[PDB]
Scaffold this active site. Sequence first.
Site, mmCIF file in Angstrom:
data_model
loop_
_atom_site.group_PDB
_atom_site.id
_atom_site.type_symbol
_atom_site.label_atom_id
_atom_site.label_comp_id
_atom_site.label_asym_id
_atom_site.label_seq_id
_atom_site.Cartn_x
_atom_site.Cartn_y
_atom_site.Cartn_z
ATOM 1 N N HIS A 61 -1.684 2.454 10.753
ATOM 2 C CA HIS A 61 -1.587 1.247 9.891
ATOM 3 C C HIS A 61 -1.534 1.642 8.412
ATOM 4 C CE1 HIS A 61 -2.713 -1.006 13.495
ATOM 5 N NE2 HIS A 61 -3.803 -0.261 13.589
ATOM 6 N N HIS A 91 -7.683 4.400 1.048
ATOM 7 C CA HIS A 91 -6.360 4.223 1.604
ATOM 8 C C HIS A 91 -5.593 3.271 0.711
ATOM 9 C CE1 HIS A 91 -8.664 0.809 3.147
ATOM 10 N NE2 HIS A 91 -7.531 0.152 2.963
ATOM 11 N N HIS A 93 -2.245 0.151 0.591
ATOM 12 C CA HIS A 93 -1.271 -0.757 1.160
ATOM 13 C C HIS A 93 -0.064 -0.756 0.239
ATOM 14 C CE1 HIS A 93 -4.515 -2.517 3.712
ATOM 15 N NE2 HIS A 93 -5.240 -2.111 2.685
ATOM 16 N N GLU A 103 -2.138 -6.458 -1.762
ATOM 17 C CA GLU A 103 -2.807 -7.463 -0.930
ATOM 18 C C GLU A 103 -3.335 -8.558 -1.840
ATOM 19 O OE1 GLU A 103 -5.363 -5.223 1.985
ATOM 20 O OE2 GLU A 103 -3.645 -5.848 3.190
ATOM 21 N N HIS A 116 -7.551 1.023 -2.016
ATOM 22 C CA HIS A 116 -8.867 0.571 -1.595
ATOM 23 C C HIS A 116 -9.786 1.746 -1.402
ATOM 24 C CE1 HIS A 116 -7.027 -3.353 0.124
ATOM 25 N NE2 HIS A 116 -7.180 -3.376 -1.188
ATOM 26 N N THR A 195 -9.389 -6.583 5.221
ATOM 27 C CA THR A 195 -8.062 -7.177 5.227
ATOM 28 C C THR A 195 -7.242 -6.812 6.439
ATOM 29 O OG1 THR A 195 -7.011 -5.371 4.010
ATOM 30 C CG2 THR A 195 -8.022 -7.177 2.716
ATOM 31 N N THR A 196 -7.797 -6.002 7.343
ATOM 32 C CA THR A 196 -7.168 -5.763 8.641
ATOM 33 C C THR A 196 -8.177 -6.110 9.719
ATOM 34 O OG1 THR A 196 -7.904 -3.505 9.053
ATOM 35 C CG2 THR A 196 -6.019 -3.760 7.655
HETATM 36 N N1 LIG Z 1 -8.274 -2.784 3.792
HETATM 37 S S1 LIG Z 1 -9.892 -2.818 3.757
HETATM 38 O O1 LIG Z 1 -10.454 -4.146 3.697
HETATM 39 O O2 LIG Z 1 -10.379 -2.006 2.682
HETATM 40 C C1 LIG Z 1 -10.523 -2.201 5.328
HETATM 41 C C2 LIG Z 1 -11.375 -1.105 5.425
HETATM 42 F F1 LIG Z 1 -11.717 -0.438 4.347
HETATM 43 C C3 LIG Z 1 -11.873 -0.684 6.653
HETATM 44 F F2 LIG Z 1 -12.670 0.375 6.712
HETATM 45 C C4 LIG Z 1 -11.522 -1.311 7.831
HETATM 46 N N2 LIG Z 1 -12.101 -0.957 9.097
HETATM 47 C C5 LIG Z 1 -11.691 -0.306 10.226
HETATM 48 C C6 LIG Z 1 -12.852 -0.384 11.128
HETATM 49 C C7 LIG Z 1 -13.049 0.147 12.508
HETATM 50 C C8 LIG Z 1 -14.385 -0.357 13.069
HETATM 51 C C9 LIG Z 1 -14.456 -1.858 13.130
HETATM 52 C C10 LIG Z 1 -15.826 -2.357 13.459
HETATM 53 C C11 LIG Z 1 -16.756 -1.281 13.927
HETATM 54 C C12 LIG Z 1 -16.877 -0.180 12.918
HETATM 55 C C13 LIG Z 1 -15.562 0.196 12.319
HETATM 56 N N3 LIG Z 1 -13.796 -1.065 10.446
HETATM 57 N N4 LIG Z 1 -13.324 -1.387 9.285
HETATM 58 C C14 LIG Z 1 -10.723 -2.425 7.761
HETATM 59 F F3 LIG Z 1 -10.421 -3.065 8.892
HETATM 60 C C15 LIG Z 1 -10.227 -2.853 6.532
HETATM 61 F F4 LIG Z 1 -9.412 -3.892 6.532
HETATM 62 ZN ZN LIG Z 2 -7.262 -1.790 2.572
#
Ligand SMILES: NS(=O)(=O)c1c(F)c(F)c(-n2cc(CC3CCCCC3)nn2)c(F)c1F
Ligand SMILES: [Zn+2]
Length: 257
Positions: A61, A91, A93, A103, A116, A195-196
């Site tokens: 992703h 990471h 987007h 986003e 992010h 956001t995912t």
């Molecule tokens: N784009 S963002 O908001 O910054 C963002 C992130 F930084 C993340 F780390 C995740 N993320 C992936 C998981 C796996 C497991 C989901 C539940 C159990 C533990 C971890 N959990 N959180 C995420 F989904 C996301 F959208």
């Molecule tokens: Zn993100």
Amino acid sequence: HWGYGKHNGPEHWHKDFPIAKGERQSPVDIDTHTAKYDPSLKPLSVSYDQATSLRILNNGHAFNVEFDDSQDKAVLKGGPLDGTYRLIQFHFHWGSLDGQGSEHTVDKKKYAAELHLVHWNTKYGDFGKAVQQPDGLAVLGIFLKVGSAKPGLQKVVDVLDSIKTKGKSADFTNFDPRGLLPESLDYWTYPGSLTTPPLLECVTWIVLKEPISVSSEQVLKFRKLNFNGEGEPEELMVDNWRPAQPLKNRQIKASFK
Ligand SMILES: NS(=O)(=O)c1c(F)c(F)c(-n2cc(CC3CCCCC3)nn2)c(F)c1F
Ligand SMILES: [Zn+2]
């Protein structure tokens, strides 16, 4: 499973993750004129001098640059936050075109990409516990516009060839995330979500006002990544962003006038 395509993208997510239609979803549009200065908001404290990067991973992703979060090495504190939040990964987007990819939006303006830096509240012991809490995460969001190159981004760009496809990782030690920050730490903040999927409502969002500039060649290299695994049909990893969600019963606060 979920993704960013026509048939599994953001408009579909609510079927597996009903919280997609929840009360504090992210991202949102930041209406700069409606955001309110909160003079009691403290300056951010970004302490990344002891950051220990480990690895970079294409997870299908985005790509994550992962850090050692088993000690207080790289931490975010202050601002709207109470307590200490440890950096676990960063990471991005990004878009298929320079006019989209972020986003969050600012007065409906989309940036080419959004960084992010993900941190978890140490009072919860581990990241998996933290995501189950309303104050579990603090994500520092930074907009990217296309212009001059960002030198501190280049080591990331350089390694992308080695993680082209889903499930590939590479050693990525001794990377200094301070090289990804703009000059100013002026920010907007609001309560939101991942956001995912799983879209958990566990994030204090801190979005910097000042974007960083990256070069067209830098973002072009992001767009050469693949969503697919090796030996599967090639699908370029582009447009891996969720659009702005309704603000609902929230106010965005600004650290600056
Ligand atoms: N784009 S963002 O908001 O910054 C963002 C992130 F930084 C993340 F780390 C995740 N993320 C992936 C998981 C796996 C497991 C989901 C539940 C159990 C533990 C971890 N959990 N959180 C995420 F989904 C996301 F959208
Ligand atoms: Zn993100």
